[PDB]
Design an enzyme around this catalytic site. Structure first.
Site, PDB file in Angstrom:
ATOM      1  NE  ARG A  17      40.326  39.726  34.522  1.00 60.07           N
ATOM      2  CZ  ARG A  17      40.926  38.858  33.718  1.00 60.07           C
ATOM      3  NH1 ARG A  17      41.246  39.203  32.477  1.00 60.07           N
ATOM      4  NH2 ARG A  17      41.206  37.642  34.160  1.00 60.07           N
ATOM      5  CG  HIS A  18      39.480  40.809  40.388  1.00 60.12           C
ATOM      6  ND1 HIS A  18      40.610  40.067  40.122  1.00 60.12           N
ATOM      7  CD2 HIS A  18      38.436  39.950  40.292  1.00 60.12           C
ATOM      8  CE1 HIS A  18      40.267  38.815  39.880  1.00 60.12           C
ATOM      9  NE2 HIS A  18      38.954  38.717  39.978  1.00 60.12           N
ATOM     10  N   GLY A  19      42.454  43.084  40.062  1.00 58.13           N
ATOM     11  CA  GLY A  19      43.834  42.706  39.825  1.00 58.13           C
ATOM     12  C   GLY A  19      43.990  41.198  39.853  1.00 58.13           C
ATOM     13  N   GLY A  73      35.944  31.352  40.324  1.00 55.83           N
ATOM     14  CA  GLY A  73      34.597  31.891  40.394  1.00 55.83           C
ATOM     15  C   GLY A  73      34.276  32.476  41.758  1.00 55.83           C
ATOM     16  NE  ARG A 113      38.394  36.794  42.269  1.00 58.87           N
ATOM     17  CZ  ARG A 113      37.427  35.993  42.769  1.00 58.87           C
ATOM     18  NH1 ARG A 113      37.386  35.749  44.069  1.00 58.87           N
ATOM     19  NH2 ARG A 113      36.639  35.307  41.938  1.00 58.87           N
ATOM     20  CD  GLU A 159      33.983  35.426  36.442  1.00 57.76           C
ATOM     21  OE1 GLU A 159      34.990  36.075  36.093  1.00 57.76           O
ATOM     22  OE2 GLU A 159      32.960  35.332  35.741  1.00 57.76           O
ATOM     23  CG  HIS A 161      28.949  28.922  41.793  1.00 56.51           C
ATOM     24  ND1 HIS A 161      30.199  28.417  42.083  1.00 56.51           N
ATOM     25  CD2 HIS A 161      28.072  28.210  42.542  1.00 56.51           C
ATOM     26  CE1 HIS A 161      30.082  27.443  42.965  1.00 56.51           C
ATOM     27  NE2 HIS A 161      28.801  27.297  43.259  1.00 56.51           N
TER      28      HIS A 161
END
Ligand SMILES: [Cl-]
Ligand SMILES: [Cl-]
Ligand SMILES: [Cl-]
Length: 171
Positions: free
Chosen positions: A7-9, A21, A54, A74, A76
Site C-alpha cells: 500500500r503506497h505511502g 481513487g 503515489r 485504486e 475509481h
C-alpha cells in the site's frame, strides 16, 4: 502463488479522510518516508505498480523499477472522488464498510473493480511485489477471509488464492 502487495505511502487526503481513487495526488513527506522504510524489507522479485504517481513513487523509493499497469489502480470513486467520508450518504458508507454493492455515479462498481484486480493477479506467472492501493490490498485480504485494512506504506504477502502469509508494518 506467493505475492507481495504494498500500500503506497500516505497523501493529504488520508489524514483529511477524503476518498482517493484515480485522482492523481502526490504523497506527503511522511508518505515518502514510509516508502523509504520499505527498502530492504521487501523481497527481490519482479515489480509491478499502479501507474498513479503515489504508487510508482513508493515503488521507486522502495528501491524498485516496476512495470506500470493501470489494473493495479485504486477503485475509481467517480463523483465520489475527493468526497469526505464523514459526509457520504449512508448507502455509500455502508457499501464501503461492508465492501459490497457499491455503484458510484460516473465510477467503478466494486464488482468491476474486483474483477479487474483478481483478473490481473490471475495473469501473474510468478511471484512478484505489487505496489498498489488500500482498496486493492483490502480486496485481496477480504477475499482471503481477513480484515483488509492495513497502514499506508505497509505490505502483505499472500499465497494467492489460498491464504495470507504475513503482514509487515514498519513504524
Ligand atoms: Cl510460490
Ligand atoms: Cl458492486
Ligand atoms: Cl487454490
Amino acid at each position: 502463488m506467493e505475492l507481495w502487495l504494498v500500500r503506497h505511502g500516505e497523501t493529504l487526503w488520508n489524514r483529511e479522510g477524503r476518498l482517493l481513487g484515480w485522482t492523481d495526488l502526490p504523497m506527503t513527506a511522511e508518505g515518502e518516508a514510509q516508502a523509504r522504510r520499505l527498502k530492504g524489507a521487501l523481497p527481490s522479485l519482479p515489480a509491478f505498480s499502479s501507474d498513479l504517481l503515489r504508487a510508482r513513487r513508493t515503488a521507486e523509493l522502495a528501491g524498485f523499477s516496476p512495470r506500470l499497469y493501470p489494473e493495479l489502480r485504486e477503485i475509481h470513486f467517480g463523483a465520489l472522488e475527493g468526497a469526505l467520508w464523514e459526509t457520504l450518504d449512508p448507502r455509500y458508507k455502508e457499501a464501503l464498510l461492508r465492501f459490497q454493492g457499491f455503484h458510484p455515479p460516473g465510477g467503478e462498481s466494486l464488482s468491476a473493480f474486483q474483477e479487474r484486480v483478481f483478473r490481473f493477479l490471475e495473469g501473474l506467472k510468478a511471484p512478484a511485489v505489487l505496489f498498489t492501493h488500500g482498496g486493492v490490498v483490502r480486496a485481496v485480504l477480504r477475499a482471503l477471509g481477513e480484515d483488509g485494512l492495513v497502514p499506508p506504506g505497509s505490505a502483505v504477502a499472500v499465497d494467492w488464492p489460498r491464504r495470507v502469509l504475513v503482514r509487515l508494518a514498519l513504524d
